[PDB]
Structures are given as structure tokens and as C-alpha cells.
Amino acid sequence: TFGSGEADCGLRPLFEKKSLEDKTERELLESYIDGR
Amino acid sequence: IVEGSDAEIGMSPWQVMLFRKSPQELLCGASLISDRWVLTAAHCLLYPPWDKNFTENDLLVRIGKHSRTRYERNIEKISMLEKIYIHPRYNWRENLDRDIALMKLKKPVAFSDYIHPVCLPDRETAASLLQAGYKGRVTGWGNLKETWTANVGKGQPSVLQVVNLPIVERPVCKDSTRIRITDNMFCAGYKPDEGKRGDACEGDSGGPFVMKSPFNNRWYQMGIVSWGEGCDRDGKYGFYTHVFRLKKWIQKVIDQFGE
Amino acid sequence: HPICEVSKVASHLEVNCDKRNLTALPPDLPKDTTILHLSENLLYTFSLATLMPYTRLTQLNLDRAELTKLQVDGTLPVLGTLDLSHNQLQSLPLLGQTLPALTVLDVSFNRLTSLPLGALRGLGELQELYLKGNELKTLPPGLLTPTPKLEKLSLANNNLTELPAGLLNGLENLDTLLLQENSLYTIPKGFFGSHLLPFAFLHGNPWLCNCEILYFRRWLQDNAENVYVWKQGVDVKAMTSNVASVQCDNSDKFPVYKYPGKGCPTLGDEGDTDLYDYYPEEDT
Numbered sequence: 015t016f017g018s019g020e021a022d023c024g025l026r027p028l029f030e031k032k033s034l035e036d037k038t039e040r041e042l043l044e045s046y047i048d049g050r
Numbered sequence: 051i052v053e054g055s056d057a058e059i060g061m062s063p064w065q066v067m068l069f070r071k072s073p074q075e076l077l078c079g080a081s082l083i084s085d086r087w088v089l090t091a092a093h094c095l096l097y098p099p100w101d102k103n104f105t106e107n108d109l110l111v112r113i114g115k116h117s118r119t120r121y122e123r124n125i126e127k128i129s130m131l132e133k134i135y136i137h138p139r140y141n142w143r144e145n146l147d148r149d150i151a152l153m154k155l156k157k158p159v160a161f162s163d164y165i166h167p168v169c170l171p172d173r174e175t176a177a178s179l180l181q182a183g184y185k186g187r188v189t190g191w192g193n194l195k196e197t198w199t200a201n202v203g204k205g206q207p208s209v210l211q212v213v214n215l216p217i218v219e220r221p222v223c224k225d226s227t228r229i230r231i232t233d234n235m236f237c238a239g240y241k242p243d244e245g246k247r248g249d250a251c252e253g254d255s256g257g258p259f260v261m262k263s264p265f266n267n268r269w270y271q272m273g274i275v276s277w278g279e280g281c282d283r284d285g286k287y288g289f290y291t292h293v294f295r296l297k298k299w300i301q302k303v304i305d306q307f308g309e
Numbered sequence: 310h311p312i313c314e315v316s317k318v319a320s321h322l323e324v325n326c327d328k329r330n331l332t333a334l335p336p337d338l339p340k341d342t343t344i345l346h347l348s349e350n351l352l353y354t355f356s357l358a359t360l361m362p363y364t365r366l367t368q369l370n371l372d373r374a375e376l377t378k379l380q381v382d383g384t385l386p387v388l389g390t391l392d393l394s395h396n397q398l399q400s401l402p403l404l405g406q407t408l409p410a411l412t413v414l415d416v417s418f419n420r421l422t423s424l425p426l427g428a429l430r431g432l433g434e435l436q437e438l439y440l441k442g443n444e445l446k447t448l449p450p451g452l453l454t455p456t457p458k459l460e461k462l463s464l465a466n467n468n469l470t471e472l473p474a475g476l477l478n479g480l481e482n483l484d485t486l487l488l489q490e491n492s493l494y495t496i497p498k499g500f501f502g503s504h505l506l507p508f509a510f511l512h513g514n515p516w517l518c519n520c521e522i523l524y525f526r527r528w529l530q531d532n533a534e535n536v537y538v539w540k541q542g543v544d545v546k547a548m549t550s551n552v553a554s555v556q557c558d559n560s561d562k563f564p565v566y567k568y569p570g571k572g573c574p575t576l577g578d579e580g581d582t583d584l585y586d587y588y589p590e591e592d593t
């Protein structure tokens with residue numbers, strides 16, 4: 015019934031947690047805007 | 051990964067390496083979803099057509115790695131397999147439909163700056179992020195080129211590779227291959243008219259296809275590297291196992307036994 | 310001002326009493342001393358209890374002081390490193406109940422000939438054990454049982470002839486295993502277990518290559534890239550692997566990883582791989 019690790023998942027220690035963005039995650043974020 | 055770049059440290063903490071004990075070789079990639087559950091492609095463990103059939107005792111799981119071949123001191127963690135669960139309706143005979151498998155670590159793994167779990171898509175996140183044009187990200191230690199035929203350059207990287215790929219609309223996906231596609235898979239890559247390149251490759255299977263929610267800032271694993279024809283070939287797209295569609299079977303085994 | 314040198318950096322103190330012809334500890338050294346160097350002195354006998362104070366002592370260096378009797382008395386709950394190498398110990402000191410926080414223990418180059426029953430019983434939270442240079446002939450079943458967190462184990466340059474089939478049981482984190490320069494001729498059934506060993510040194514041994522040297526035969530094959538040859542410190546034995554260093558009867562041109570079991574039992578169990586060809590090509 016259990017695994018352990020969620021609610022904390024998807025948040026990188028060396029990044030989100032330190033409020034730091036990796037070199038290319040913006041590429042992904044700009045993709046959520048209509049490109050025409 | 052073809053036409054990708056070297057990953058930054060701890061950039062893909064959930065990255066898992068499926069290691070074969072004997073001979074010692076990297077088979078596939080995989081992802082961490084909890085302190086004791088790993089998710090990879092089914093054909094990485096079972097593929098009758100190529101008499102491939104790996105049992106728990108034949109593998110090891112290296113977690114929190116960057117370099118493809120250097121043992122990394124107090125960075126990576128090596129875990130053994132307690133149990134393998136391949137989707138009971140995995141179609142190896144034709145198109146690798148439902149190319150998925152869960153692995154249960156023998157003992158829980160502690161997280162670190164290098165080891166962390168990725169989130170699985172929910173009802174709204176899947177519906178929100180899985181749109182053509184939206185970019186995902188694939189990571190892996192797989193080949194850097196089609197290695198089965200003479201080609202210039204090295205075969206596999208020395209460091210984990212990363213590449214960002216646009217999600218392709220089914221119609222385009224379907225007519226780019228003679229292989230039969232199902233709702234349980236999706237394709238991604240740049241189109242002939244987009245200029246940029248990039249795609250997964252052999253050895254990359256199991257690797258995760260992740261996207262970051264613009265809402266909560268968390269990374270979700272939308273797919274699993276499954277197959278493709280060649281690597282980064284014009285008019286051709288990589289195909290990934292649709293994780294969300296198979297959510298009910300994952301939930302069912304993950305939560306099946308007490309603890 | 311004492312007899313030693315007192316230094317620092319952060320909230321740590323470091324006292325150096327090396328080569329000062331001491332026969333006991335120079336009394337009243339900073340109470341906040343964390344590191345203590347009593348190397349090359351004349352401590353034929355020493356009492357741990359004599360360190361009871363200095364409750365912030367983490368590293369203790371009693372090497373090269375020709376110690377033959379260590380009196381394990383008091384406790385050093387914060388002592389982590391302990392160097393007793395290059396001395397005259399003939400029996401291994403029972404440090405379990407005394408140094409709970411110990412993680413590194415070097416009793417290299419002494420006069421140990423065997424190990425007690427519950428030798429390490431107690432120091433379960435240990436990471437490195439150095440016993441290189443003694444004259445051990447055989448090891449106790451469960452010698453490492455108390456130390457599941459062990460990462461490095463050095464048993465090089467001893468008079469070992471045979472290892473306990475289940476020596477390596479547990480030890481999930483073990484990555485370096487030094488057994489070079491012994492008197493080993495064969496490896497037990499499943500000695501290395503399922504665990505992956507990044508750095509192993511097995512050279513300088515008289516390996517008897519027969520039909521029960523097959524397990525170790527394939528193991529060398531699989532872990533060919535993990536077998537190295539010890540040269541010395543600072544080298545970082547991460548420079549060019551060398552599985553050929555393990556030779557039959559220690560005989561040069563007779564690498565164990567290339568010995569056909571000719572007329573040996575079961576034609577498919579030990580060293581039954583090497584079925585396909587591979588053509589790898591990685592970079593810098």
C-alpha cells in the first residue's frame with residue numbers, strides 16, 4: 015500500500031530547494047505559451 | 051541521448067541506471083518514484099524476440115549517478131531488486147504496447163542532493179501538460195548515435211545526457227511510422243521544418259520523459275523511453291510509454307502489499 | 310607553550326606532539342582539542358582513560374610510538390579516527406564499548422596473528438578498517454558482522470591462506486577490498502556475493518588454478534575493470550584497471566582470468582558467459 019517520497023517529489027535539492035534554476039528549464043517553460 | 055548535452059549535477063536526481071551484474075553492463079535507464087520503487091521500460095527486462103529475460107537476481111540499480119562509468123564515492127547508491135512487476139498486458143510481439151515495469155528495491159534508499167523522487171502525473175496535470183508543442187525532457191546514458199552502422203563520433207557519453215523535446219500530435223506521430231501506435235504511447239521530437247534536433251536512442255529505454263508544472267514548480271514523469279526507428283532521423287519520432295494512462299496499474303501494484 | 314604545537318580553524322583544536330620523546334601525555338592540553346597527534350613517541354603502554362577529558366577529541370594518532378599495550382579504559386564518544394599503525398600490538402584491542410563514534414580504525418603493521426571472537430563487537434558504525442602488514446592467517450566468521458556500514462577493508466600483506474566463505478556478508482557499502490600480497494590460493498563459493506566492488510586488489514598471491522578456482526575465474530572476468538594493483542598513497546587507485554595482475558600460482562604469464570578449466574565438472578555454471586561480442590566506444 016505504500017512507497018514513501020511523495021509530497022516532496024519533483025523538487026530537486028540542488029535547484030528548486032535552493033531556489034536555483036538549471037540552464038535549460040526555461041526552454042520548457044516558454045513552451046507552455048502559444049508559439050503562433 | 052542523441053544531440054543532447056551534458057547534464058548539470060543533481061539536475062535529474064531521480065535518474066536510475068539499470069545495471070546488469072554479469073557481464074557488468076548498463077542495460078537501460080529508469081526513474082525513482084519513491085524510496086523503494088523504480089520505474090522503467092518493460093522491454094528492458096523482457097523481450098522474447100531477442101531472448102532477453104532478466105530476473106531480479108540478474109540486476110542492480112545504481113542511483114544518483116552522473117558519470118556513466120566512474121564509481122562515484124559517496125554520491126551514488128547501489129540497490130538490489132526485491133521484485134519485478136511487468137505490466138501483464140505488455141505487447142512485446144508487435145509494438146511494445148504498455149512498455150512499463152515496476153521494480154521494488156530490496157531496501158529503502160535515503161535521499162540526498164543527488165537522489166530524489168520524481169512526481170507521477172495526476173488527472174489535471176496530465177490533461178494540462180500533455181499538449182503538442184509543449185516541451186518535455188529526456189535524460190539517459192544511452193548511445194550518442196546509431197551504433198549498429200558505421201558513423202563518426204563516440205558511441206556513448208561519459209556523463210548523463212539531457213535533451214528537451216516537443217510533444218508531437220498523434221496524426222504526425224502515426225504517419226511517421228509503419229509501426230501501429232496505441233493510446234498508451236506518445237511521440238516527441240522536432241519536425242523537419244523546425245531546425246533543432248534531438249532524440250533518445252538505444253540504451254536510453256526506461257529513462258524518464260519529465261515536464262515541470264508551471265503551477266506548483268514540481269517535475270512530473272509524463273513518459274518512459276520506449277522505442278523509435280533509428281535515432282534523430284528526419285521525419286522520425288521517439289515513442290514513450292504514456293505513464294498517466296497506465297496510472298491505475300501502477301497504483302494497483304505499488305499499493306498492493308502492506309507496508 | 311606546552312611541549313606540543315597548538316593550532317586551529319573553526320571550532321576545532323589540533324595539538325601536535327609528534328617525535329617529542331613522550332612516555333605519557335603532556336598534561337593539560339587545550340580542553341577543546343579535537344585532533345591529537347602523539348606519533349613517533351615512546352608510549353610502550355598507554356591508557357585511553359588518560360584522555361577522558363578533552364571531550365571534543367575526534368581524531369587520535371598513536372602511530373610509530375612502539376605501543377605494545379593499550380589500556381582501553383575511559384570513553385571518547387566523539388573519537389572518530391584512530392591510528393594505531395606501525396606499533397607492537399600482538400592482540401587486537403577491544404574498542405567496542407569504548408569508542409562508539411569510531412568510523413576509521415587503522416591497526417596496520419603491528420604483530421597481530423589472529424583476531425578475537427567478538428573482535429569488533431560494538432563498533433558497528435565503522436567505515437574503514439586497516440589491518441595491512443600483520444601476520445593474520447585466518448579470519449573469524451562474523452568478523453564484520455558488527456560493522457555493516459564498512460566501506461573499506463585492508464588485509465594486504467598478512468599470511469592469510471584461506472578466507473571465510475561468508476566474510477563479506479552484509480557490507481552493502483563496501484567498495485575497496487585489499488588482499489594483495491597474501492598466501493591465498495583460492496576463493497570460497499559465493500565469496501563476493503551479489504555486491505559490486507569498485508576497487509579490488511588481489512595480486513601477489515599464489516592462486517592454485519584448478520577446478521575450484523572457477524568461481525573466482527568468472528568473477529575476475531566480470532569485474533576485470535575493478536581489479537587494480539596497489540602502488541602507494543596519493544595515487545588514487547582509479548588509474549588504469551588491471552585484471553591480469555591476478556596470476557596463477559603467482560606465476561607471471563598465468564592470469565587467472567584466462568584459465569580454461571579443461572576437464573572440470575558442470576560444463577555450465579561457473580564462467581559460463583562470454584556468449585556475445587561487444588564493441589563499445591565512450592569518450593573523455
Ligand SMILES: *[C@@H]1O[C@H](CO)[C@@H](O[C@@H]2O[C@H](CO)[C@@H](O[C@H]3O[C@H](CO[C@H]4O[C@H](CO)[C@@H](O)[C@H](O)[C@@H]4O)[C@@H](O)[C@H](O[C@H]4O[C@H](CO)[C@@H](O)[C@H](O)[C@@H]4O)[C@@H]3O)[C@H](O)[C@H]2NC(C)=O)[C@H](O)[C@H]1NC(C)=O
Nearest residue numbers: 095096097098099101102103104105106107108134136142
Ligand atoms: C525468465 O527466467 C526465469 C529463469 O531465469 C524463468 O523461470 C524459470 O523457469 C523454470 C521452468 O522451466 C523454473 O524451474 C524450476 O522451478 C519449477 C517451479 O516453478 C516455480 O517455483 C520456483 C521455485 O522453486 C520458482 O523459481 C518459479 O518462478 C515458480 O514459481 C520446478 O517445478 C522445476 O522443477 C523441474 O525440474 C526438476 C529438476 O531440476 C525436477 O526435479 C522437477 O520434477 C521439475 O520437472 C525447476 O526446479 C525456474 O525455477 C525458473 N526460475 C526462476 C528465477 O523463476 C522464466 O520463466 C523466464 N521468463 C520467460 C517468459 O521466459
Ligand SMILES: N=C(N)NCCC[C@H](NC(=O)[C@@H]1CCCN1C(=O)[C@H](N)Cc1ccccc1)C(=O)CCl
Nearest residue numbers: 144145250251252253254255276277278280281288
Ligand atoms: N530513436 C529512439 N528514440 N529510439 C529509442 C529506442 C530505445 C530502445 N528500444 C528498442 O531498441 C526497442 C526494442 C525493440 C526494438 N525497439 C525499437 O525501438 C525499434 N523501434 C524496433 C521496434 C519497434 C517496435 C516494436 C518492436 C521493435 C531501448 O530500450 C534501449 Cl537499448
Ligand SMILES: *[C@@H]1O[C@H](CO)[C@@H](O)[C@H](O)[C@H]1NC(C)=O
Nearest residue numbers: 422443444445446467468469
Ligand atoms: C608470515 O610469512 C613471513 C614471510 O615469509 C614469515 O617471516 C612469518 O614467520 C609468517 N608468519 C606466520 C605467523 O606464519
